[PDB]
Amino acid sequence: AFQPFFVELTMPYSVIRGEAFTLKATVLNYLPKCIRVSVQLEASPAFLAVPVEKEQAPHCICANGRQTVSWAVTPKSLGNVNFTVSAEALESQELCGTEVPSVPEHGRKDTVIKPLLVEPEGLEKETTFNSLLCPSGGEVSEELSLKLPPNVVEESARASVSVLGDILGSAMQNTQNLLQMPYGCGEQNMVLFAPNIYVLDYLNETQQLTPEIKSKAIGYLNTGYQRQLNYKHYDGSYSTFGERYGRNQGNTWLTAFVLKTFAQARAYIFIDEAHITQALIWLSQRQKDNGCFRSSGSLLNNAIKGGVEDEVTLSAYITIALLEIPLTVTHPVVRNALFCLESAWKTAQEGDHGSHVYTKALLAYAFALAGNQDKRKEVLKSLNEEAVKKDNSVHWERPQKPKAPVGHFYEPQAPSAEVEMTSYVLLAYLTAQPAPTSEDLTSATNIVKWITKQQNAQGGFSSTQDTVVALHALSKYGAATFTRTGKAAQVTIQSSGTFSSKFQVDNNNRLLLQQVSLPELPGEYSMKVTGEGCVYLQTSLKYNILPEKEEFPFALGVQTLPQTCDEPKAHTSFQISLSVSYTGSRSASNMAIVDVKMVSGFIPLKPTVKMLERSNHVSRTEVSSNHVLIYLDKVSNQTLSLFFTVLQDVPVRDLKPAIVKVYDYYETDEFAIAEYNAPCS
Amino acid sequence: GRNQGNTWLTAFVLKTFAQARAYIFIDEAHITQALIWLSQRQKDNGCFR
Numbered sequence: 001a002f003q004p005f006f007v008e009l010t011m012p013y014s015v016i017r018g019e020a021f022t023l024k025a026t027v028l029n030y031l032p033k034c035i036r037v038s039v040q041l042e043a044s045p046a047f048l049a050v051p052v053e054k055e056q057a058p059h060c061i062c063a064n065g066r067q068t069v070s071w072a073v074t075p076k077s078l079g080n081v082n083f084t085v086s087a088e089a090l091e092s093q094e095l096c097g098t099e100v101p102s103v104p105e106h107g108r109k110d111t112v113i114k115p116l117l118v119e120p121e122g123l124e125k126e127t128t129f130n131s132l133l134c135p136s137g138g139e140v141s142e143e144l145s146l147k148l149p150p151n152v153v154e155e156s157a158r159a160s161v162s163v164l165g166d167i168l169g170s171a172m173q174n175t176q177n178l179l180q181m182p183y184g185c186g187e188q189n190m191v192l193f194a195p196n197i198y199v200l201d202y203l204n205e206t207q208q209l210t211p212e213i214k215s216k217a218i219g220y221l222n223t224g225y226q227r228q229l230n231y232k233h234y235d236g237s238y239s240t241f242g243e244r245y246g247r248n249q250g251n252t253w254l255t256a257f258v259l260k261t262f263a264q265a266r267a268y269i270f271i272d273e274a275h276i277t278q279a280l281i282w283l284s285q286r287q288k289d290n291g292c293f294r295s296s297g298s299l300l301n302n303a304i305k306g307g308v309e310d311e312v313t314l315s316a317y318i319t320i321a322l323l324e325i326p327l328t329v330t331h332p333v334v335r336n337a338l339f340c341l342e343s344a345w346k347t348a349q350e351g352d353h354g355s356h357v358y359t360k361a362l363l364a365y366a367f368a369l370a371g372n373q374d375k376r377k378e379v380l381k382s383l384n385e386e387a388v389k390k391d392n393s394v395h396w397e398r399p400q401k402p403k404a405p406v407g408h409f410y411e412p413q414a415p416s417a418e419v420e421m422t423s424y425v426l427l428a429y430l431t432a433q434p435a436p437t438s439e440d441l442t443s444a445t446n447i448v449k450w451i452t453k454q455q456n457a458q459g460g461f462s463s464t465q466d467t468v469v470a471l472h473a474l475s476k477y478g479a480a481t482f483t484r485t486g487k488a489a490q491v492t493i494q495s496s497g498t499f500s501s502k503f504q505v506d507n508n509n510r511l512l513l514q515q516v517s518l519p520e521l522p523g524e525y526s527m528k529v530t531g532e533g534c535v536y537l538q539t540s541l542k543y544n545i546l547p548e549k550e551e552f553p554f555a556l557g558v559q560t561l562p563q564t565c566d567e568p569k570a571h572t573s574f575q576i577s578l579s580v581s582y583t584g585s586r587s588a589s590n591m592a593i594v595d596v597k598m599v600s601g602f603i604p605l606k607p608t609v610k611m612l613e614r615s616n617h618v619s620r621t622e623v624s625s626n627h628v629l630i631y632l633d634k635v636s637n638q639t640l641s642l643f644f645t646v647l648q649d650v651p652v653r654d655l656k657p658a659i660v661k662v663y664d665y666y667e668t669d670e671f672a673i674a675e676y677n678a679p680c681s
Numbered sequence: 682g683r684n685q686g687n688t689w690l691t692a693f694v695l696k697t698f699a700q701a702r703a704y705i706f707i708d709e710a711h712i713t714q715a716l717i718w719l720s721q722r723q724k725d726n727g728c729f730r
């Protein structure tokens with residue numbers, strides 16, 4: 001195989017508002033002959049071309065001849081754009097040197113089509129809404145008004161809608177990931193075994209998964225259950241290490257998670273029912289005769305989980321576990337804790353805060369065993385309304401809070417917030433005895449889509465645990481893949497500007513995705529549907545922010561370089577010191593949040609080495625290869641510092657700074673930004 | 682596994698495990714597991730064999 005020509009281009013990068021970056025073209029000859037090659041670029045009015053070599057053409061080169069061919073351009077649009085360049089060799093031009101054959105094969109002219117991405121100005125976000133219309137052989141309609149424009153940015157706000165009932169899950173690329181006994185700290189054993197348990201339910205039920213690896217996961221669990229035998233308490237409770245703390249209770253998330261799968265896993269190796277009923281009588285002894293018991297919870301415990309330590313939600317955690325054992329007075333006990341939860345549910349009905357984490361998981365499952373849970377099918381709609389989500393996930397930002405207290409969507413819990421929410425939400429969806437064809441099924445299919453789209457089994461997710469929990473969603477949907485859905489649904493999408501696009505859904509459009517956008521600055525979405533069964537349609541309004549925002553209590557102490565380039569060798573190598581700590585770190589969840597990215601045309605080499613070196617008393621040495629993660633440590637203020645440099649990939653650049661800031665410390669206050677750009681420019 | 686054992690010594694000793702859970706701690710789990718073992722063997726109607 002051989003070709004006497006090839007193109008080396010400039011992969012620009014997700015680039016900045018100033019679109020004048022550097023773009024060149026370098027065509028090189030490997031055949032020993034000299035050949036002329038005319039060159040031009042197929043352009044369009046979508047961007048503002050500026051000719052550098054306006055008057056003279058990059059003309060003619062020979063064997064191993066080097067020529068840079070670059071132009072200037074300052075586009076107006078945003079998004080993926082492909083530049084179509086062409087280069088052709090002609091005949092009868094023996095004047096560059098002595099001779100030009102210029103007779104190639106059917107690959108006559110050289111052309112390249114380079115899709116370059118451009119990042120819009122400022123920081124990107126959205127604000128979606130959630131809407132449900134389900135007539136029973138009739139018609140229901142609603143209006144959605146989409147307006148929150150404070151401190152707008154020019155030409156960023158757009159939107160779209162969709163609805164789905166997806167079947168046809170792709171494949172199993174990401175189901176393969178592994179970890180082992182913590183070399184560093186045994187405290188991580190809790191977050192080890194908490195997800196490894198339900199791998200039992202994932203072997204056959206998927207039909208796509210690789211059950212070899214979960215069959216090995218149960219091999220690890222054959223030691224895990226002995227660790228639990230060693231992590232138990234004599235009285236019946238559980239902790240990180242076990243007994244010698246007698247008169248006290250322990251966390252119930254992991255024991256409630258694991259007791260049902262000990263009941264399903266008492267087949268391979270025998271665990272007696274004594275081990276279940278001792279935990280049970282431990283659950284039974286703590287209940288008062290009249291009162292909803294007190295339980296002071298240690299909040300921000302890195303070993304166990306990150307939460308809010310609301311003792312009533314723990315009183316509900318015991319009872320989701322009680323719901324399994326078929327004792328029939330146990331169900332009156334879960335009714336008592338359901339009255340405590342009814343306190344919590346009125347707190348939810350106010351719609352201000354119930355921590356948005358726990359009752360979500362428990363309300364469905366408590367009644368999903370019984371079979372009269374249409375009330376819970378109704379509250380799961382309210383759970384679905386509580387999300388600023390992508391088409392399948394949540395990314396970053398609650399809309400425009402005037403109200404100070406918000407429960408849990410942009411807390412220091414930062415596994416990107418989509419997985420640990422959507423997982424328990426799907427657990428809530430499809431535990432139903434009756435045919436769940438109604439909106440819960442459709443939303444479950446909405447969740448499964450991006451889970452199937454994750455075609456990377458790395459394990460270097462935005463988080464580190466939650467890739468384990470993401471495989472709950474695809475897996476439990478394996479049995480729910482069989483259903484009956486598709487009706488005389490005729491959807492109508494209208495807005496103020498005399499526009500009306502019609503849509504329809506059936507059993508063959510059950511899996512069809514409808515994407516349609518509108519560019520109007522007003523936002524209004526009146527809908528009208530028909531048919532039978534209940535299905536949920538979703539919105540998404542993408543828009544950038546942060547042209548220039550004020551300073552705020554957070555202290556991102558970033559230092560770029562010694563105050564300027566002011567020299568011919570700078571603008572390439574300059575180490576950026578960052579020293580950061582929000583003093584607010586009190587009792588939310590393990591240190592999870594960080595974002596640090598590269599500005600447009602700068603590549604990291606040594607930063608990787610430094611981060612590999614960094615460790616603050618405890619560490620996971622997690623990485624993204626454009627970011628850095630050394631944060632997981634105990635409750636402490638008193639920041640540290642660093643320095644990391646780059647190299648110049650972009651020779652020329654227009655003026656606007658790139659910035660990489662995520663910031664979540666407490667809910668009452670403003671979310672506390674702090675910034676400083678790059679001075680060399 | 683699927684068989685019972687003599688009850689003279691366990692019946693003799695369970696009450697004094699309840700009296701002897703003061704010096705060194707035996708949990709009530711150890712009592713109630715023997716108890717549920719005593720409870721599982723009873724038929725609904727018959728005097729078990």
Ligand SMILES: *[C@@H]1O[C@H](CO)[C@@H](O)[C@H](O)[C@H]1NC(C)=O
Nearest residue numbers: 080081082083113114115116
């Ligand atoms: C540009 O390239 C992208 C990425 O493959 C592709 O999706 C798009 O269709 C291309 N546009 C064309 C053909 O100009």
Ligand SMILES: *[C@@H]1O[C@H](CO)[C@@H](O)[C@H](O)[C@H]1NC(C)=O
Nearest residue numbers: 204205206207477478479480
């Ligand atoms: C395997 O999983 C399927 C659902 O995917 C379920 O219907 C079946 O009962 C499971 N076990 C068997 C019998 O194959």
Ligand SMILES: *[C@@H]1O[C@H](CO)[C@@H](O)[C@H](O)[C@H]1NC(C)=O
Nearest residue numbers: 583585586634635636637638
């Ligand atoms: C934070 O700084 C304070 C300063 O008084 C210090 O007492 C504390 O140990 C530091 N870490 C914690 C516990 O937040």
